[PDB]
Write an enzyme that holds these catalytic residues in place. Structure first.
Site, PDB file in Angstrom:
ATOM      1  N   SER A  41      39.807  25.741  64.489  1.00  0.00           N
ATOM      2  CA  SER A  41      39.496  27.160  64.688  1.00  0.00           C
ATOM      3  C   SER A  41      38.755  27.811  63.506  1.00  0.00           C
ATOM      4  O   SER A  41      37.611  27.368  63.152  1.00  0.00           O
ATOM      5  CB  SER A  41      40.767  27.927  65.185  1.00  0.00           C
ATOM      6  OG  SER A  41      40.355  29.148  65.778  1.00  0.00           O
ATOM      7  N   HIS A  67      44.203  26.103  73.141  1.00  0.00           N
ATOM      8  CA  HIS A  67      43.592  26.235  71.819  1.00  0.00           C
ATOM      9  C   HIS A  67      44.425  25.401  70.807  1.00  0.00           C
ATOM     10  O   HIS A  67      43.909  24.681  69.977  1.00  0.00           O
ATOM     11  CB  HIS A  67      43.580  27.701  71.446  1.00  0.00           C
ATOM     12  CG  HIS A  67      42.868  27.982  70.163  1.00  0.00           C
ATOM     13  ND1 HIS A  67      41.559  27.665  69.977  1.00  0.00           N
ATOM     14  CD2 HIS A  67      43.282  28.545  69.005  1.00  0.00           C
ATOM     15  CE1 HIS A  67      41.184  28.007  68.766  1.00  0.00           C
ATOM     16  NE2 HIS A  67      42.201  28.535  68.165  1.00  0.00           N
TER      17      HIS A  67
HETATM   18 CL   LIG Z   1      41.535  30.913  63.648  1.00  0.00          CL
END
Ligand SMILES: [Cl-]
Ligand SMILES: O=Cc1ccccc1
Ligand SMILES: O=Cc1ccccc1
Ligand SMILES: O=Cc1ccccc1
Ligand SMILES: O=Cc1ccccc1
Ligand SMILES: O=Cc1ccccc1
Ligand SMILES: O=Cc1ccccc1
Ligand SMILES: [Cl-]
Lengths: 259, 260
Positions: free
Chosen positions: A81, A236
């Site tokens: 991320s 995610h």
């Molecule tokens: Cl992040």
């Protein structure tokens, strides 16, 4: 037996090294060495994000980790991320210490625009932040935008394919953080000679509700990678929802870069 | 469907609320309420243990949890390891908010000796510190002894029956902490009218290698409880090694203190 590698794992904003607790023992059992870096003001670092005023300060534990490695050691450097930005900053400093950058559901910046570019792009189209709390902190570097994820937003957009234990764990451990978008928008552009010289691959989750697939294709198309690996069914937080499949992807990357 | 309960969970020294990550959704899926408290300078509290100099400061988040409960709410208060000392301190303050104290592989202090008593006995008895690092920090009221577990010690003495993932997790989360032995030696004894008046039960792991099963007997003989429950095959980190069995024990307790 085939040669193993050293994986250095870099967590996302508002999280910490702890996210890697499932993946680390899978990698190690297969014979690899793993360093799970704790970024500043992350995880159990006793230092609030308000004391970490810039993205270089935030990244400093990674840069120190690479600095410390013995001469000619090369690592598979995995950024998750916001950890994509961290690994790009690190690669512009120590490119010869990195065998391959692994962008895992990550921000993939380029060498053409300001380092905040792909963040700014995502924020323009983001969707709902839900119960996430936004605040400011004034510093001698300007104003820092802080975020603290809300539990509903975590559940719906990060952790929707994770076991309930992991979601609970995350509620116990997530912290106020920052994406440093102001700091990033005025740093110098990542260099072609450092960052741009390093081999890179992208690993994407099929069900990431934060970093959607079209946005991924756009970043890659803006800044090419050598290969793309998909994890079918990953949210995610793919190290928590599909660690075995993440291990398989990383294992395929270790074979593909074993020369 | 009979009454569910509010469980307040109190972690051990050098750990944090995260230890309860498997237990909490078990309790919650059975209809109970859970608060997993995070004590000062523990878990994700961005404050070093050196800044928390007293056991009363350490325990403040628990005190504030109890203080914020609605009027007449009573909880099942579970204290793990050093958590035993915390829950006793809390019981000395708010006896009427606590339906039963659950000492889980926990230090069980008495109302006769100084509050450090049972801790001093364990420190005299225990030979297995291994790579744990002991250090001191000077305060304006005296020396504060600190500890930071070593990873070999964790694996051999706390986590030896846990899944490898849980041990890796602990390695990325544990912190320098303290057992507050100097401060507890200086405090007034726990009282018979507060702590001593609250119902208490003991839940023990049959394979606890840090608070040995014999030392646990000595504690209970020293200061009795209403009932002892045993979790067969538990290590000290029994909420990580045998969470469902722990769930079973706390459900049995919840049954034995059903609300008339
Ligand atoms: Cl992040
Ligand atoms: O996407 C954010 C969100 C927040 C609350 C409930 C559902 C979704
Ligand atoms: O919606 C508020 C907000 C604040 C800062 C950055 C992005 C969004
Ligand atoms: O430089 C920023 C700053 C922040 C808090 C206190 C003092 C200075
Ligand atoms: O949970 C027990 C314990 C003992 C020594 C150090 C940290 C924890
Ligand atoms: O073994 C107990 C102990 C206590 C304080 C300092 C060193 C050792
Ligand atoms: O309890 C600590 C220890 C240390 C080295 C080997 C085995 C156990
Ligand atoms: Cl403890």
């Amino acid at each position: 037996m085939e040669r193993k590698h050293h994986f250095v794992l870099v967590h996302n904003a508002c999280h910490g090294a702890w996210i890697w607790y499932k993946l680390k023992p899978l990698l190690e059992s297969a014979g690899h060495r793993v360093t799970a870096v704790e970024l500043a003001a992350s995880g159990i670092d006793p230092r609030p994000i308000q004391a970490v005023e810039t993205v270089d300060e935030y990244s400093k534990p990674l840069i120190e980790t690479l600095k410390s490695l013995p001469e000619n050691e090369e690592v598979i450097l995995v950024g998750f991320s916001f950890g994509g930005i961290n690994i790009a900053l690190a690669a512009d400093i120590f490119p010869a210490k990195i065998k391959v950058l692994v962008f895992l559901n990550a921000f993939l910046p380029d060498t053409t625009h300001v380092p905040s570019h792909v963040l700014d792009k995502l924020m323009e189209m983001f969707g709902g932040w839900g119960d996430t709390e936004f605040s400011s902190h004034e510093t001698r570097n300007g104003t820092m935008s802080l975020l603290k994820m809300g539990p509903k937003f975590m559940k719906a957009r990060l952790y929707q394919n994770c076991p309930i234990e992991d979601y609970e764990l995350a509620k116990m451990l997530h912290r106020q953080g920052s994406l440093f978008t102001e700091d990033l928008s005025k740093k110098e552009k990542f260099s072609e000679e450092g960052y741009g010289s390093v081999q890179r691959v992208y690993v994407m989750s099929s069900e990431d509700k934060i970093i959607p697939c079209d946005f991924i294709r756009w970043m890659i198309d803006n800044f090419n990678v050598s290969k793309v690996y998909e994890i079918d069914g990953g949210d995610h937080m793919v190290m928590l929802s599909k660690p075995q499949k993440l291990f398989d992807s990383l294992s395929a990357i270790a074979t593909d870069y074993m020369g």
